[PDB]
Amino acid sequence: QSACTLQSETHPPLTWQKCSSGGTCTQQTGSVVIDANWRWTHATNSSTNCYDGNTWSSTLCPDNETCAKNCCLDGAAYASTYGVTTSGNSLSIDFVTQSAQKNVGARLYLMASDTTYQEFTLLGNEFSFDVDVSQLPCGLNGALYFVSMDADGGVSKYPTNTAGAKYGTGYCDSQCPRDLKFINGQANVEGWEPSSNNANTGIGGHGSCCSQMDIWEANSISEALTPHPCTTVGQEICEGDGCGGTYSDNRYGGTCDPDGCDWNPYRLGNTSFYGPGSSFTLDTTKKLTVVTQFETSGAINRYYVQNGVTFQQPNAELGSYSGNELNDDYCTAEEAEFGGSSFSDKGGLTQFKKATSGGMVLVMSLWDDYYANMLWLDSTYPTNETSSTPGAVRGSCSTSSGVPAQVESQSPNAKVTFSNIKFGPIGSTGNPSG
Amino acid sequence: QSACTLQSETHPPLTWQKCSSGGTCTQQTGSVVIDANWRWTHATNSSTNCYDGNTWSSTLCPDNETCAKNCCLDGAAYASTYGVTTSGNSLSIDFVTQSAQKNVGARLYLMASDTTYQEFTLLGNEFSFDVDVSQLPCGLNGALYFVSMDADGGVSKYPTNTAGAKYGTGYCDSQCPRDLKFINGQANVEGWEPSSNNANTGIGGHGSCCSQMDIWEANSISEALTPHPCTTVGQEICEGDGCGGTYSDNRYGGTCDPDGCDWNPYRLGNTSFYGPGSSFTLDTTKKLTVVTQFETSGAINRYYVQNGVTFQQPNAELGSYSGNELNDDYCTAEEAEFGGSSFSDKGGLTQFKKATSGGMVLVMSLWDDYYANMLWLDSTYPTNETSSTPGAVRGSCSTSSGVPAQVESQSPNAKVTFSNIKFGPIGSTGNPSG
Numbered sequence: 001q002s003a004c005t006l007q008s009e010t011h012p013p014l015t016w017q018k019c020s021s022g023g024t025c026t027q028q029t030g031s032v033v034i035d036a037n038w039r040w041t042h043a044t045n046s047s048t049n050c051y052d053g054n055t056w057s058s059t060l061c062p063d064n065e066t067c068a069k070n071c072c073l074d075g076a077a078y079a080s081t082y083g084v085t086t087s088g089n090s091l092s093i094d095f096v097t098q099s100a101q102k103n104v105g106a107r108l109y110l111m112a113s114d115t116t117y118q119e120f121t122l123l124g125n126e127f128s129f130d131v132d133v134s135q136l137p138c139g140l141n142g143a144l145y146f147v148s149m150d151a152d153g154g155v156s157k158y159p160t161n162t163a164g165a166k167y168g169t170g171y172c173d174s175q176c177p178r179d180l181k182f183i184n185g186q187a188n189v190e191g192w193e194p195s196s197n198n199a200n201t202g203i204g205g206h207g208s209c210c211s212q213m214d215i216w217e218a219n220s221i222s223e224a225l226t227p228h229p230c231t232t233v234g235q236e237i238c239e240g241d242g243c244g245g246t247y248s249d250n251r252y253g254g255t256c257d258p259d260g261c262d263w264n265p266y267r268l269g270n271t272s273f274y275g276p277g278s279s280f281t282l283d284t285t286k287k288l289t290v291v292t293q294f295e296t297s298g299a300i301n302r303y304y305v306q307n308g309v310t311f312q313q314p315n316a317e318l319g320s321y322s323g324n325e326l327n328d329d330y331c332t333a334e335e336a337e338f339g340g341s342s343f344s345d346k347g348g349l350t351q352f353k354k355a356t357s358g359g360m361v362l363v364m365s366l367w368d369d370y371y372a373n374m375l376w377l378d379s380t381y382p383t384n385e386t387s388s389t390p391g392a393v394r395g396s397c398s399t400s401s402g403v404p405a406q407v408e409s410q411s412p413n414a415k416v417t418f419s420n421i422k423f424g425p426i427g428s429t430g431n432p433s434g
Numbered sequence: 435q436s437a438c439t440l441q442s443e444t445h446p447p448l449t450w451q452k453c454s455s456g457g458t459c460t461q462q463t464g465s466v467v468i469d470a471n472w473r474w475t476h477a478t479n480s481s482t483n484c485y486d487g488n489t490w491s492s493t494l495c496p497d498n499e500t501c502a503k504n505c506c507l508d509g510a511a512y513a514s515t516y517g518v519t520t521s522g523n524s525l526s527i528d529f530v531t532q533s534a535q536k537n538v539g540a541r542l543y544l545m546a547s548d549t550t551y552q553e554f555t556l557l558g559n560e561f562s563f564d565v566d567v568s569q570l571p572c573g574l575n576g577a578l579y580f581v582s583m584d585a586d587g588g589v590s591k592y593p594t595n596t597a598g599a600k601y602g603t604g605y606c607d608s609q610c611p612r613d614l615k616f617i618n619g620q621a622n623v624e625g626w627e628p629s630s631n632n633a634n635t636g637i638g639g640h641g642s643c644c645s646q647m648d649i650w651e652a653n654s655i656s657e658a659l660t661p662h663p664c665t666t667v668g669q670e671i672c673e674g675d676g677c678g679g680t681y682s683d684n685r686y687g688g689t690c691d692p693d694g695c696d697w698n699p700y701r702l703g704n705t706s707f708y709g710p711g712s713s714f715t716l717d718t719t720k721k722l723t724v725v726t727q728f729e730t731s732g733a734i735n736r737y738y739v740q741n742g743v744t745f746q747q748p749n750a751e752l753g754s755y756s757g758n759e760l761n762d763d764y765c766t767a768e769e770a771e772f773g774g775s776s777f778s779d780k781g782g783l784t785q786f787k788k789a790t791s792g793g794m795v796l797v798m799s800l801w802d803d804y805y806a807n808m809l810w811l812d813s814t815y816p817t818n819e820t821s822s823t824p825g826a827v828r829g830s831c832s833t834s835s836g837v838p839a840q841v842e843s844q845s846p847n848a849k850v851t852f853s854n855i856k857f858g859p860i861g862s863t864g865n866p867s868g
């Protein structure tokens with residue numbers, strides 16, 4: 001796609017700290033951009049929609065190539081249309097925003113410049129952020145994570161994409177998502193099937209795959225930390241059901257691991273660690289600090305700080321595994337005890353280390369779940385299982401929770417606030433911000 | 435040996451913090467006891483010495499059994515004879531103390547009660563302490579470490595030892611030391627050879643072996659962190675040169691690893707990390723906090739705090755190893771690049787995990803080195819090597835430094851102060867002390 005300018009594109013600014021081993025941190029100035037899927041897609045030479053509701057213009061978009069030539073992405077009114085605001089080092093995303101039309105949530109990338117994404121090499125480093133999840137009920141997910149996207153959003157590889165990172169192109173993740181309207185500088189109109197339950201979305205014949213570090217998927221009830229390896233580390237197109245992922249019939253018939261080696265303290269048996277109010281170790285009615293460390297072995301360590309008190313990731317015992325570090329032994333034990341082979345089939349932490357050794361883009365988002373109502377995060381899943389199934393219970397939410405239309409109607413003012421991002425060598429981010 | 439009471443035994447008290455995962459710490463009250471080797475050893479029924487200078491009484495001690503029956507250990511005047519004092523959570527050890535006779539240094543164990551050692555299970559936990567090494571020049575070693583000693587100092591196994599932990603019996607370490615005057619409830623007079631350079635010591639026909647976690651061996655110039663595995667985890671007698679260790683002809687012909695997998699930041703190439711004055715990352719003229727974490731994988735992590743600034747163990751690159759965690763890959767790479775096979779021959783971190791999974795006793799000591807002048811810690815070693823030999827340079831001290839008689843004459847008022855010991859689950863010790 002190209003870019004159009006009927007609405008100007010001004011990325012909300014966002015600062016963050018880069019810390020060094022010598023013990024100081026210095027402020028960096030970036031900004032955030034909204035993913036292309038949220039944008040208005042229209043004819044280059046008029047305001048005629050190329051995509052409307054959940055269907056494509058059959059005339060402007062008779063095939064993927066013609067569609068990309070005919071169509072452009074336009075700018076975003078971040079606050080009024082999308083409910084996205086920033087203030088210094090803080091970013092807030094509102095759940096449902098009513099303007100001329102209703103918008104649901106947002107997916108945002110941190111930029112290095114107006115036209116390029118910020119890339120982070122996670123390996124040997126740590127990433128710290130503060131979050132307020134108090135306004136996230138059952139069925140919502142305020143997510144902070146990393147994906148192996150190109151810094152230009154795909155322009156160098158696919159010159160029919162001239163919109164680039166400035167317009168949030170180039171997304172990929174470990175679900176090999178097929179709901180993207182543009183992949184590899186072409187539309188995804190070929191094979192398009194509108195969602196049966198979502199007025200704004202569909203599934204196309206192509207998907208976009210890459211490695212994913214799910215640092216934080218969470219609401220006020222549950223939180224999970226999950227690496228997802230792929231056999232191709234970086235962004236790669238996939239064809240139809242060969243994609244695997246949430247958007248395909250065959251979840252496991254692709255190049256990525258859509259399940260991941262997840263660590264959810266509630267799932268692992270500590271139901272007292274994280275939740276709303278003073279009966280939990282971390283009180284989710286209040287802001288908390290989350291720190292994630294990527295040691296060179298490829299294991300992941302985690303601690304939290306709230307009101308000046310530090311807590312490592314709680315210990316878990318699973319099969320022969322015991323401890324609080326997300327390592328090979330944990331992931332192998334998880335598969336043994338909870339089931340599945342996707343994470344190991346895709347090469348486990350060894351393959352995942354190839355992603356964190358390279359550059360990844362930071363994503364912050366707020367979403368509800370049209371496929372599974374977020375039950376995999378905060379409820380019992382599958383819903384016919386009981387607590388006697390190992391790993392079935394992931395949170396306290398009812399198995400009836402998270403129906404998108406219901407949560408959008410009942411909790412439109414839900415929101416997430418991410419703030420005080422700090423990045424540097426392991427051990428460095430607790431030092432004073434510059 | 436038995437105990438005698440011509441001098442009363444009052445262990446200097448010492449408090450420390452036990453921290454919990456829930457984020458609080460509570461004060462514990464223990465005390466310190468001096469190792470039996472430092473004590474006066476005399477006939478049970480008089481003040482006649484069983485051991486004097488570096489030789490044994492041939493009449494009281496004609497063999498190991500008769501000697502133990504005839505002889506007792508007596509109490510210690512901690513301050514006036516040994517230069518050992520405590521105040522709340524602080525312990526100080528002076529280098530040379532002149533009373534009726536000259537004493538050099540001390541080795542001390544933390545007690546649970548007047549008659550038992552405190553045991554710590556290191557695995558899954560972390561140990562924090564503060565240290566002032568400002569008064570430790572080249573050739574001195576203020577050491578804090580753990581060994582797999584019996585809590586009773588050997589009494590249950592060896593009933594001819596009735597003195598026990600109260601009198602500091604039962605020592606063992608990864609050098610399988612043969613300088614101990616009592617091992618396994620018998621004397622070590624058989625095979626005794628007085629030291630050629632030490633008026634107060636010798637080497638006997640028996641040694642005492644066990645696993646050793648050298649958390650801290652350091653002076654103002656260099657510091658090292660070193661696990662040492664043994665094929666028998668706990669305390670075990672050894673016979674003569676079959677002992678291996680510093681005190682034998684054949685260093686590597688025993689059940690313990692006397693070299694260990696050592697991590698010395700200077701040795702590994704960061705000569706700027708630790709030293710006297712503001713040109714170093716950690717200024718050794720001032721107190722610093724040292725934290726050591728024993729993750730369940732069996733790897734060891736380390737960070738430091740000084741004036742509120744936190745530093746992870748500095749990154750090192752060695753062969754194919756890169757990072758700051760002391761793990762299998764580090765230790766294997768060290769052997770490959772610096773030489774040796776002792777650590778791996780004795781089972782590496784896997785065998786060492788058997789020690790940290792069990793109970794270990796905390797040892798604090800101050801010593802000079804009659805075998806190697808501490809050059810392995812703070813100088814170039816062996817001394818004929820140059821900087822072009824990988825790992826030869828371990829510190830900035832001259833290869834002429836650390837001659838015991840010289841340092842005892844020039845720096846008698848050298849001292850070490852250990853304080854603010856805190857122990858608990860990984861992530862817990864930075865929380866407020868109770």
Ligand SMILES: O[C@@H]1[C@@H](O)[C@H](O[C@@H]2CO[C@@H](O[C@@H]3CO[C@@H](O[C@@H]4CO[C@@H](O)[C@H](O)[C@H]4O)[C@H](O)[C@H]3O)[C@H](O)[C@H]2O)OC[C@H]1O
Pocket residue numbers: 037038039040041051052053081102103104105179180200201
């Ligand atoms: O000036 C007018 C434009 O503002 C207007 O723009 C519309 C803006 O909203 C667009 O709809 C977006 C599409 O994305 C939705 O989010 C999905 C959430 O689930 C994800 O899996 C998926 O990938 C996302 O696509 C978002 O909720 C929704 O609001 C709409 O298509 C634009 O046309 O157009 C008309 C102009 O007059």
Ligand SMILES: O[C@@H]1[C@@H](O)[C@H](O[C@@H]2CO[C@@H](O[C@@H]3CO[C@@H](O[C@@H]4CO[C@@H](O)[C@H](O)[C@H]4O)[C@H](O)[C@H]3O)[C@H](O)[C@H]2O)OC[C@H]1O
Pocket residue numbers: 471472473474475485486487515536537538539613614634635
């Ligand atoms: O009342 C008098 C007693 O106080 C007196 O006791 C003497 C106290 O000092 C004893 O000598 C100790 C022996 O240990 C030395 O340390 C060695 C350091 O290197 C280590 O490897 C080794 O294992 C340690 O043994 C310490 O420096 C030295 O002072 C002496 O033997 C006692 O007899 O006895 C006479 C009473 O009248």
Ligand SMILES: OC[C@H]1O[C@@H](O[C@H]2[C@H](O)[C@@H](O)[C@H](O)O[C@@H]2CO)[C@H](O)[C@@H](O)[C@H]1O
Pocket residue numbers: 175226246258259260262371372376377381382
């Ligand atoms: O709704 C898709 C969701 O699945 C998670 O993986 C689940 C998996 O679907 C389920 O079969 C298993 O029992 O639990 C897994 C972990 O919660 C993914 O982690 C998530 O990214 C989504 O893809």
Ligand SMILES: OC[C@H]1O[C@@H](O[C@H]2[C@H](O)[C@@H](O)[C@H](O)O[C@@H]2CO)[C@H](O)[C@@H](O)[C@H]1O
Pocket residue numbers: 609660680692693694696805806810811815816
């Ligand atoms: O003086 C004995 C001392 O040796 C250390 O191990 C040395 C070893 O002696 C040397 O050959 C090698 O080059 O360096 C090693 C590490 O410094 C031990 O660590 C120490 O405990 C002592 O036993």
Ligand SMILES: *[C@@H]1O[C@H](CO)[C@@H](O)[C@H](O)[C@H]1NC(C)=O
Pocket residue numbers: 020021022023703704705706707715745746747748749
């Ligand atoms: C030494 O280590 C410190 C702490 O990690 C680091 O800040 C410094 O840059 C290192 N210097 C060198 C020269 O290796």
Ligand SMILES: *[C@@H]1O[C@H](CO)[C@@H](O)[C@H](O)[C@H]1NC(C)=O
Pocket residue numbers: 269270271272273281311312313314315454455456457
């Ligand atoms: C849950 O984790 C916290 C933090 O480690 C710990 O303090 C608490 O005891 C744990 N509780 C249970 C019931 O597992």
Ligand SMILES: [Co+2]
Pocket residue numbers: 206239
């Ligand atoms: Co195709």
Ligand SMILES: [Co+2]
Pocket residue numbers: 295297299325729731733759
């Ligand atoms: Co680790």
Ligand SMILES: [Co+2]
Pocket residue numbers: 640673
């Ligand atoms: Co014997």
